[PDB]
Design a protein around this ligand. Structure first.
Ligand SMILES: [Mg+2]
Ligand SMILES: [Zn+2]
Ligand SMILES: [Zn+2]
Length: 1339
DNA sequence: CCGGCTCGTATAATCTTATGTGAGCGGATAAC
DNA sequence: GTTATCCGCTCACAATGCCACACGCCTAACGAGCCGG
RNA sequence: CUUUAACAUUAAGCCCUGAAGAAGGGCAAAAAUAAACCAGCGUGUGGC
């Protein structure tokens, strides 16, 4: 029907089924097919469902339209349309009751969770193997106690009429309604208030939440068991018309026939007083038959004749890649469409495409019919059909009137990102292929290798106007993933423009003088002066530094004839120094980009067209071919290979004498072949790039070459140094598929021949790369599918949330070069707070403005290192994202409008380039200030600097204050310098030992042995070839039971032998000793201030991004600190080693367990702040969230995923990854109960908690306390309020079972739901629809 | 002169190169 | 002893899109049919 | 015994609307439900 709100779901009562149906099927036969009338009371019928033909009795009595409503008596068939055959249900009244298969085997077992009874027991009740007891009463036995035949017989001896024990589905049906619901809830609530054990509280909170949701619905525990089973309207499972004889049956019809045969046989056996064994067996057969009908997968049994495939049950018509969500309710086939192969056609403009004439007559047939019947050239529709099937000459003029302003959508099939479908205007072509403008071809990522494209037609008025405004190809220049133009001129235009704008030192007409650029053109056409000969010309140029107008300026510049020709298509704005250089690929790309920045939109489009036209024209007049004498072999290749063979023979002889081992032999050979390959490549590149010597009109000079493939590489059209390296120099080192890299490299190039073995070796890398591509495609597609499932319901919905939180951005520095500066990251995001000038108390930026480009430069000039800026993850708006929390939009210019469905474009921007992926001393480098962060150090006796703080960090600074470089300075290392010591570059400023942990002291004196007994705790090991016998101290577990209860310790004393206190505190720090602690300076030996007491020895591709957005737990994570306090070890081997951290003021209830196998960092007297590392390794983000706050997990995810995308040169803006992070941490647990109705262990979406706390804080009550969860993206999709949006995604079965038990109700808000139903989307245009509806509802 | 043959048709049965997850449940396992 | 945990076994559920093309989708024995021997 | 005998027909309701004994209904009770005539899905291959 129409005008309906939210969809409601619940269980279905038997009386509801009798309210549905229109008759009772009794006979299992479909049709007689002697005559093809349907059999009465079969699966097909006419009295039950409806008329076979239109408006006719099956008897054939009433055949007139004016007899509607009155049924026949010859056939009992209501004279109605055959659409009624699509819509009337049927019912079957079963003999025995029957268990539903989903509620038994969803696995959370709904019956088993409800009755508190294990699943296997209920299974061997339902399949007739046991008994249950139903109100035994004055009986030894209990209720849920189950038996066998022997205990049942012995009970019949004992309590022969007391207990009531049944079996089969009737017994479970008896147990279900015998149970109350209120008493179980109140009893188990009192029991949960009388329980402290955790797992019992888990199970009981599950059971009472099940019961409370089950009572707050409408339904009952009787309804999980079927009694009356409904059947589908028989047009919806149609009988296949074959050719000759019989009709081919579907799967549903065979399953219903089997069920009805079994039901009739059981009903007759009940009619004749059958013995008990046979009716038990028959009820088991009927239960198994209904379990085969509803879902064939739990018992994979029903297979048909001549095709041993599982038949398609009703649940198989919903799941999978062919059920009604993925197949038919999202991707529908569409009329007015078409398909062809494509073809270039370089004469087009940017906003049009080539359309075949005949196919365009075929598409627009109704518009043609309307134009013909308008102009009087026809009267009926059949006259118009005859005229357009004759293809008379008036029809082509009519078709050209139909085209003129009516755009057409074009599409390429594996659509990744939102530039995949675009709208053009048509230009008619007598042909059979679709022409397509060549600049757009990079955006589609189209070949011309046979790639096919498709055509759709917008046909209403709003669709034409949207395809003109929102989607015409003159409106998509910048990319939504990053603000870069997608209209880069490709390979051939690059070659043309690079060949035009060069120079050579002696040509025709060199050094003459010219008037305009057009006289240089007239000299090029006549053949008087060549295309590139240097010449002084006169140029006028316009500069718009005047505030909104143009300033002329005329001068004489030393330039080239080709550059003067190219200047004629540059518009008024740009300065002449944009076309004075050699103009490769990136140069003309930034030419287009600066033309977009300074002038606007329309000169950018028309300038890209003029560039494409003249680039193809002069690429034609070049004649740049390629030939076998354009690949210059070096003259020095032969002796380099000879010297490499001499060196490998010498290393082979040094291995043969036995001096060098095999691994170092391997390493020397691979190093010298790497060096030889690099030398040959250097020689060939130096021989190609500059060999061209030409006569000056003096003697000789040098210049950049005019060789063919060097122009094809130096312009950046096709190829790199690597491909042109393999063509003439030798090719690399081929690696075998085991993972090793082979000894002998391929000594030959491609211009010479390869022999048999070397080609056979190269085949390995070929097939490896091909298989990698073949699997990488599918994995990227699946990950894109899941991300756009997650982020779909999120729309920029209001203007200004108006908060004062956010994040702090600093330009990222690994320690090598600064990877991303502050300009590129925080271009175009709205400032959180007023970042002050380095001139203090001077407002450099207002707190609530937008960092546009000029403003970004004026922020850059004062060398700001950290800017605070508003993110999406802290935006305040319920059910959406505020506008100023998201900033300016990519692919357009200004701030984002209210409605842009940013979650979908974000998921596409992450998931689009997924195909391109794959599947001992600190040394400063420049001069600046030396800053050490979290440093607490002391100079020892030997002048070295040992640090008593773990978290020391190195910052190389300039004179300004911005960070030049950064490194990590370990705890207590060998430091060549101190803090703030102004040093210069190239300096190794630090060192340490990777096999010695610092057990450094704090005072001077002696070190004495407390509980360090040789034979109990410590051992005396003599280094047998040096002479310094030392002591080795283990931990408690590695030594035996003689020192297991003992704790060895190096007690820090003075030279007298007494504990000198730490300067600042009053605590003696005796040093208890961990394992592998080699104590060198023993008792009686004087120590220093912080001296080494004990020496202690110790992915990346696409699945990294997959395992990160799943947020799955890494192996052996890093233990953090829960709250600050003094560390204290405790009891050993109660599973693990205990640890108690005592706060300064609060108590210490948490006594954390640590596997003593894994190592540790902190010491006993040491105390650390919360969230700090204990055992090194990977980290799960759960801990990062619950300890370091909310922004920390966003920064961790952004930096890691952005490292994986910076490794391949892929540039993706950060706000997309932020708005994917927001949809991951939306659920929440509750810590208290609060003052409202929320339970404690209640998982609940955060925004409802936030509006509940806002409503309670409006009054004077107390709120609730919540811990923000963090789920995987598939777990976040699969737990959503809309039960449609979780049904369309994977595991539809479990979602429909849980949603049908709970009886939910889906508001239809979001994108995916309204696509399913088929009204306007609440995202784009139609957003302005929905709130216009919403104010209609509330008022 | 009913079904022996011959046909219309309704309906029952002895794999064996996969991976990675999560999620749950039965059996051991370390304490007052 | 008995109780609250830890761990190994078993099992459901996912794995891009589109295109063309092409050939496939029962029968030994239980209720009727013909009429010969 | 004086010139052919025979007048029959007892059974189906009550109430409302309606110009009526013109007609339209409900309730106490029940056997029995030709024609003149507008006009698919499951395997394989290949491509991107
Ligand atoms: Mg291609
Ligand atoms: Zn009829
Ligand atoms: Zn906000």
């Amino acid at each position: 029907t129409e005008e309906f709100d939210a969809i409601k779901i619940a269980l279905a009562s038997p009386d509801m089924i009798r309210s549905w149906s229109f008759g009772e099927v009794k006979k299992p036969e479909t049709i007689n097919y002697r005559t093809f009338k349907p059999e009465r009371d079969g699966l097909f019928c006419a009295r039950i469902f409806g008329p076979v033909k239109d408006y006719e009795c099956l008897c054939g009595k009433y055949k007139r339209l004016k007899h509607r409503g009155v049924i026949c008596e010859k056939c009992g068939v209501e004279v109605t349309q055959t659409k009624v055959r699509r819509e009337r249900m049927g019912h079957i009244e079963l003999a025995s009751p029957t268990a539903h298969i989903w509620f038994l085997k969803s696995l959370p077992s709904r019956i088993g969770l409800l009755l508190d009874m294990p699943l296997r027991d209920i299974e061997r009740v339902l399949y007739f193997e046991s008994y249950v007891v139903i109100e035994g009463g004055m009986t030894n036995l209990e209720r849920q106690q189950i038996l066998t035949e022997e205990q049942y017989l012995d009970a019949l001896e004992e309590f022969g009429d007391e207990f009531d024990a049944k079996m089969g589905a009737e017994a479970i049906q008896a147990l279900l309604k015998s149970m109350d619901l209120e008493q179980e809830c109140e009893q188990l609530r009192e029991e949960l208030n009388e329980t402290n054990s955790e797992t019992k509280r888990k199970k009981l909170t599950k059971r009472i939440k099940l019961l409370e949701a089950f009572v707050q619905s409408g339904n009952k525990p009787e309804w999980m068991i079927l009694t009356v089973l409904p059947v589908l309207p028989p047009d919806l499972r149609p009988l296949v018309p074959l050719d000759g004889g019989r009709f081919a049956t579907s799967d549903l019809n065979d399953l219903y026939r089997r069920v009805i045969n079994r039901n009739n046989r059981l009903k007759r056996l009940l009619d004749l007083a059958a013995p008990d064994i046979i009716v038990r067996n028959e009820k088991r057969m009927l239960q198994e038959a209904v379990d085969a009908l509803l879902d064939n997968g739990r018992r994979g049994r029903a297979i048909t004749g001549s095709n041993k495939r599982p038949l398609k049950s009703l649940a198989d018509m919903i799941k999978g890649k062919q059920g009604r969500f993925r197949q038919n309710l999202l991707g529908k086939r569409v009329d007015y469409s078409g398909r062809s192969v494509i073809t270039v056609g370089p004469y087009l403009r940017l906003h049009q495409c080539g359309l075949p004439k005949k196919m365009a007559l075929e598409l627009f047939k109704p518009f043609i019919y309307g134009k013909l019947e308008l102009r009087g050239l026809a009267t009926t529709i059949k006259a118009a059909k005859k005229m357009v099937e004759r293809e008379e000459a008036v029809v082509w003029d009519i078709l050209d009137e139909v085209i003129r302003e009516h755009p057409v959508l074009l599409n390429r099939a594996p659509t990744l990102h939102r530039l995949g479908i675009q709208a053009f205007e048509p230009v008619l072509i007598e042909g059979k292929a679709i022409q397509l403008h060549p600049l757009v071809c990079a955006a589609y990522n189209a070949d011309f290798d046979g790639d096919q494209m498709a055509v759709h037609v917008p046909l209403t008025l709003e669709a034409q106007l949207e395809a003109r405004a929102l989607m015409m190809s003159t409106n998509n220049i910048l990319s939504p993933a990053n603000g870069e133009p997608i209209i880069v001129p490709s390979q051939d235009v690059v070659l043309g423009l690079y060949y035009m704008t060069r120079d050579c030192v002696n040509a025709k007409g060199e050094g003459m003088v010219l008037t305009g650029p057009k006289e240089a053109e007239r000299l090029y056409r006549s053949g008087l002066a060549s295309l590139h000969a240097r010449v002084k010309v006169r140029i006028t140029e316009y500069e718009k530094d005047a505030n909104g107008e143009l300033v002329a300026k005329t001068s004489l510049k030393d330039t080239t004839v080709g550059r003067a020709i190219l200047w004629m298509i540059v518009p008024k704005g740009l300065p002449y120094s944009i076309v004075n250089q050699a103009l490769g690929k990136k140069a003309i790309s930034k030419m287009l980009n600066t033309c977009y920045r300074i002038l606007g939109l329309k000169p950018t489009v028309i300038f890209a067209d003029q560039i494409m036209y003249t680039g193809f024209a002069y690429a034609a007049r070049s004649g740049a071919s390629v030939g076998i004498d354009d690949m210059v072999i070096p003259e020095k290749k032969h002796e380099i290979i000879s010297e490499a063979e001499a060196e490998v023979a010498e290393i082979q002889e040094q291995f043969q004498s036995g001096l060098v081992t095999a691994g170092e032999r391997y390493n020397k050979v691979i190093d010298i072949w790497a060096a030889a390959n690099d030398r040959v490549s250097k020689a060939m590149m130096d021989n190609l790039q500059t060999e061209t010597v030409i006569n000056r009109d003096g003697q000789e000079e040098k210049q950049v070459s005019f060789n063919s493939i060097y122009m094809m590489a130096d312009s950046g059209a096709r190829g790199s140094a690597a491909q042109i390296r393999q063509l003439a120099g030798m090719r690399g080192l081929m690696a075998k598929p085991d993972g090793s890299i082979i000894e002998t490299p391929i000594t030959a190039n491609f211009r010479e021949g390869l022999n048999v073995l070397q080609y056979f070796i190269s085949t390995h890398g070929a097939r490896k790369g091909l298989a990698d591509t073949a699997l990488k495609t599918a994995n990227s597609g699946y990950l894109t599918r899941r991300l756009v499932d997650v982020a779909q319901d999120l729309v920029v919905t209001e203007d200004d949330c108006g908060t004062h939180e956010g994040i702090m951005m600093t330009p990222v520095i690994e320690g090598g070069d600064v990877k991303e500066p502050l300009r590129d990251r925080v271009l175009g995001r709205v400032t959180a707070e007023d970042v002050l000038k380095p001139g203090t108390a001077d407002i450099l930026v207002p707190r609530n403005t937008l960092l546009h480009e000029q403003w970004c430069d004026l922020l850059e000039e004062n060398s700001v290192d950290a800017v605070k800026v508003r993110s999406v993850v802290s935006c305040d708006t319920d059910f959406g994202v505020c506008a100023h929390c998201y900033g300016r939009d990519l692919a357009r210019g200004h701030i984002i409008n209210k409605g842009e469905a940013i979650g979908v474009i974000a998921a596409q921007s992450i998931g689009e380039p997924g195909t391109q992926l794959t599947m001992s001393s600190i040394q400063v480098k420049n001069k600046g200030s030396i800053k050490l962060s979290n440093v607490k150090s002391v100079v020892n006796s030997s002048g070295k600097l040992v640090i008593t703080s773990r978290n020391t960090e190195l910052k190389l600074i300039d004179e300004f204050g911005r960070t030049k470089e950064s490194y990590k300075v370990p705890y207590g290392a060998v430091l060549a310098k101190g803090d703030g010591e102004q040093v210069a570059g190239g300096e190794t400023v630090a060192n340490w030992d990777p096999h010695t942990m610092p057990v450094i002291t704090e005072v001077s004196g002696f070190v004495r042995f407390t509980d360090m007994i040789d034979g109990q705790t410590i051992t005396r090991q003599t280094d047998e070839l040096t002479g310094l016998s030392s002591l080795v101290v283990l931990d408690s577990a590695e030594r035996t039971a003689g020192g297991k209860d003992l704790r060895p310790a190096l007690k820090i004393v003075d030279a007298q032998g007494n504990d000198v206190l730490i300067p600042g505190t009053d605590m003696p720090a005796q040093y208890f000793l961990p394992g592998k602690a080699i104590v060198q300076l023993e008792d009686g030996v004087q120590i220093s201030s912080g001296d080494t007491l004990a020496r202690i020895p110790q992915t990346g591709g696409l699945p990294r991004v997959a395992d990160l957005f799943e947020a799955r737990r890494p192996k052996e994570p890093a233990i953090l600190a829960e709250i600050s306090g003094i560390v204290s070890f405790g009891k050993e081997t109660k599973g693990k080693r205990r640890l108690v951290i005592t706060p300064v003021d609060g108590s210490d209830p948490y006594e954390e367990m640590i596997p003593k196998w894994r190592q540790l960092n902190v010491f006993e007297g040491e105390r650390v702040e919360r969230g700090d590392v204990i055992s090194d390794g990977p980290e799960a983000p759960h801990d990062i969230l619950r300890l370091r706050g909310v922004h920390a997990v966003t920064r961790y995810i952004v930096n890691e995923v952005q490292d994986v995308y910076r490794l391949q040169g892929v540039k993706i803006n950060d706000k997309h990854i932020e708005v994917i992070v927001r949809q991951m941490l939306r659920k929440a647990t509750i810590v208290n109960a609060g003052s409202s109705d929320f339970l404690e262990g209640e998982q609940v979406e955060y925004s409802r908690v936030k509006i509940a706390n806002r409503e309670l804080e409006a009054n004077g009550k107390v709120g609730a306390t919540y811990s923000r969860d963090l789920l995987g993206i598939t777990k976040a999709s699969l737990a959503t309020e809309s039960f449609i949006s979780a049904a369309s995604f994977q595991e539809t079965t479990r979602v429909l079972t849980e949603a049908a038990v709970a009886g939910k109700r889906d508001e239809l808000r979001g994108l995916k739901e309204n696509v399913i139903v088929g009204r306007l989307i609440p995202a784009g245009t139609g957003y302005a629809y929905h709130q216009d509806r919403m104010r209609r509802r509330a008022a």
